[PDB]
């Protein structure tokens, strides 16, 4: 049925492997300020929230973007514009929520 | 904390696979146990109705991934090992 | 220096090491057609050249886009527009040509 | 033919150590031979100027993606093979 979506998994799970703990951490409520698929970030927020530097919540970001799970902008200003590109990637965030 | 790793090894793995190198893996662990024992790829080939090929190059790539290793016997079997912790489970539910 | 490039390598590497052999060969056609990041692919021009069926040219592609290194899209008419996302890529690909 | 999951593997793995701890087996590995081998992590701390953790999930990390294995002895050293045929030169150039 399912189109082989594993390489999909296989990439969001070798993503992850890779965050540092603080860098998971940043990550779980970075998506949850999330709108679904694409949003709006701002890291401050997050930052002062879970109490850590902004370099961990953007390298996490980038992290996450080289690996092509998702794709971010620079909207200079405010926040910075997130777009996920991988379908299987929410569900394995969602999923090991703790 | 790490055992992510080993599942992206696990899925990366099971992700190069064949559609029916896949079926192929799915009966050859479905020959119980999960760590070790034997088979010959003739006596599920015979069996299953896929050729002796499939179950060759399907465990090849296992190989390959580091999931599992095999001395090939002296040609009256040969011995599967799986050495991923999380490969066990991880199998399970596939198509 | 390299800011980890790595991941897109891994991600690259992976998606290559599950084509069949058909399938890569029919990509080393596929992108060399191309101009450079993104182009058109016409399948039966590559399918006609190699000696293989559309499904596989079609394979190698769906292969290639869940992993995420690509991304494609209908131009039903004529051809099929396709779009590299990941820079490595077509070093890899350059790189093993045989 | 299959050599691609194995390199897949090696970056994947090494592509998830920390900038420092890829440094630490930078120099862990520069420890020669190429297969196997020991040391501790108490004489690379004290050595090149890295703690001695970075080097103890370094490691746990390479083990967890199939790419080595260690039997960290009876505390008077930590035995390291390479299990991964490619590791080796794919690691060589590195950053």
Chains 1, 3 share one sequence.
Do not use: C, P, W
């Amino acid at each position: 049925h399912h189109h082989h979506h594993h390489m999909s998994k296989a990439v969001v799970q070798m993503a992850i492997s890779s965050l540092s703990y603080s860098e998971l951490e940043a990550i779980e409520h970075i998506f949850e300020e999330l709108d679904g698929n694409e949003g709006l970030l701002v890291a401050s927020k997050i930052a002062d929230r879970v109490g850590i530097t902004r370099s961990v919540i953007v390298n996490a970001l980038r992290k996450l973007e080289s690996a092509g799970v998702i794709e971010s902008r620079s909207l200079g200003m405010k926040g910075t514009y997130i777009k996920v590109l991988n379908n299987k990637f929410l569900i394995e965030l969602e999923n090991l929520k703790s």
